Design a protein around this ligand. Structure first.
Ligand SMILES: *[C@@H]1O[C@H](CO)[C@@H](O)[C@H](O)[C@H]1NC(C)=O
Ligand SMILES: *[C@@H]1O[C@H](CO)[C@@H](O)[C@H](O)[C@H]1NC(C)=O
Ligand SMILES: *[C@@H]1O[C@H](CO)[C@@H](O)[C@H](O)[C@H]1NC(C)=O
Ligand SMILES: *[C@@H]1O[C@H](CO)[C@@H](O)[C@H](O)[C@H]1NC(C)=O
Ligand SMILES: *[C@@H]1O[C@H](CO)[C@@H](O)[C@H](O)[C@H]1NC(C)=O
Ligand SMILES: *[C@@H]1O[C@H](CO)[C@@H](O)[C@H](O)[C@H]1NC(C)=O
Ligand SMILES: *[C@@H]1O[C@H](CO)[C@@H](O)[C@H](O)[C@H]1NC(C)=O
Ligand SMILES: *[C@@H]1O[C@H](CO)[C@@H](O)[C@H](O)[C@H]1NC(C)=O
Ligand SMILES: *[C@@H]1O[C@H](CO)[C@@H](O)[C@H](O)[C@H]1NC(C)=O
Ligand SMILES: *[C@@H]1O[C@H](CO)[C@@H](O)[C@H](O)[C@H]1NC(C)=O
Ligand SMILES: *[C@@H]1O[C@H](CO)[C@@H](O)[C@H](O)[C@H]1NC(C)=O
Ligand SMILES: *[C@@H]1O[C@H](CO)[C@@H](O)[C@H](O)[C@H]1NC(C)=O
Lengths: 135, 135, 135
């Protein structure tokens, strides 16, 4: 993961952020640039060789080699009564982003209950922009 | 994952963000650029060789080699009564993004209960923009 | 996943964002650019060799080699009574994006209960734009 970037307003290799009142003139700004990037990553050469009970040559009664489980998860239990029992909102809004009593859930799961798993996984997750940009 | 980017308003390799009042003139701005990018990633050369109980040559009674389970997940249980028992909203809004009592859920799952899985998975997830841009 | 991008308003390789009052003139802006990109990714050369119980040569009574399960998921259980028992909304709106009591669900699943799975999966998920752009 080479560039996990979080630039705030903006990114740029070569920028001229000139943004208030600036009489500027007769500039030469010669720019030779050689920005080579090389990426030679994640060269897996693996030989797992994953094996159960290779050679029971004779008479070996085997039993219960791999008991995974039993198991529960029960991950998300809000259990939120919220018995206000007198609501008088009287809610005057102006140009406000306003989230009320919302349940934003992003449950991303992968590679669950898999005996074996080679190679690789990847879970990216962007989040909301939500730009009012009011007057 | 080379560029997991989150640029805020904007990205640009070579930008001129000139955005207030700026008399500018007679500039040469020569730009030689060689931006080569090379990506040579994820070269898997794997030999899993995944095997159960290769050679029971003789008389081996085998039993219960791999008991996965039993199991439950029960992931999302809101259980949200919300018995207000007197609602007088009286809700005057102006140019407000307003989420009320919404349940945003994005349940992304993959590769579940798979004995074996080679290669790779990938779960991207963008989120909402929601740009009011009011007056 | 090389560019998982989230540019906020806009992206551009070579931009001139000139957006307020700017008398600008006699500029040469020569731009030699060589933006070669090479992508040589995900070259899988795998030999899984996935095998159960290769050679029971003699007399081996086998049994219950792979018991996956039993199992439940029961993922999404809102269970949201919401017995307000006096609603007087009186809801005057102006040019507001307004979500009320909506249940946005995006359940993306794939590769479930598959004994084996080679190659690769991919789950992208965009989200809503929802641009009011009111007066
Ligand atoms: C910019 O260049 C011209 C030409 O060489 C020169 O006459 C002028 O004086 C320069 N600008 C200023 C503000 O002096
Ligand atoms: C520009 O940079 C490249 C790379 O280093 C070089 O080969 C070339 O001679 C340079 N040219 C000038 C005019 O500086
Ligand atoms: C991968 O490993 C094998 C086993 O030793 C070897 O013969 C081969 O040269 C290796 N290749 C690379 C690119 O590492
Ligand atoms: C193997 O595991 C199961 C799981 O509970 C159990 O019921 C059984 O008795 C075990 N076998 C032996 C021989 O103990
Ligand atoms: C821009 O260039 C012209 C021509 O060389 C020059 O006469 C002028 O003075 C320059 N600009 C300014 C503000 O001086
Ligand atoms: C521009 O850059 C390239 C790459 O380094 C180089 O071969 C070339 O000579 C350069 N030209 C000038 C005029 O600088
Ligand atoms: C992959 O591995 C095999 C086994 O050793 C080897 O012969 C081959 O050269 C390797 N290739 C690469 C590109 O690593
Ligand atoms: C194998 O596992 C099952 C799962 O509960 C169990 O009922 C059974 O008794 C096990 N076998 C032995 C021989 O214990
Ligand atoms: C732009 O170029 C002309 C021609 O060279 C020059 O006369 C003029 O003065 C320049 N602009 C300004 C504002 O000086
Ligand atoms: C432009 O760039 C290319 C690539 O580096 C180079 O071959 C060429 O000579 C350059 N030309 C000029 C006029 O700079
Ligand atoms: C793939 O692996 C085989 C087995 O060793 C090997 O002969 C072959 O050269 C490899 N090819 C590449 C492109 O890695
Ligand atoms: C094999 O598993 C099943 C699943 O419950 C079980 O009923 C059975 O008794 C098992 N066999 C043995 C020999 O234990």
């Amino acid at each position: 993961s080479i560039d996990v970037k979080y630039i705030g307003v903006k990114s740029a290799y070569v920028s001229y952020d000139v943004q208030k009142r600036t009489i500027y003139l007769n500039i030469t700004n010669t720019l030779n640039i050689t920005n080579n990037n090389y990426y030679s990553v994640e060269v897996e050469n693996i030989t797992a060789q994953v094996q159960f009970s290779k050679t029971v040559i004779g008479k070996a009664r085997l039993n219960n080699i791999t008991i995974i489980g039993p198991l529960d998860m029960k991950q998300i239990d809000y259990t939120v009564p919220t018995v206000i029992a007198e609501e008088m909102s009287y809610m005057y809004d102006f140009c406000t982003l306003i989230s009320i009593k919302v349940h934003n859930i992003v449950l991303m799961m992968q590679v669950t209950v898999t005996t074996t798993y080679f190679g690789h996984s990847e879970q990216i997750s962007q989040e909301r922009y939500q730009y009012v940009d009011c007057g």
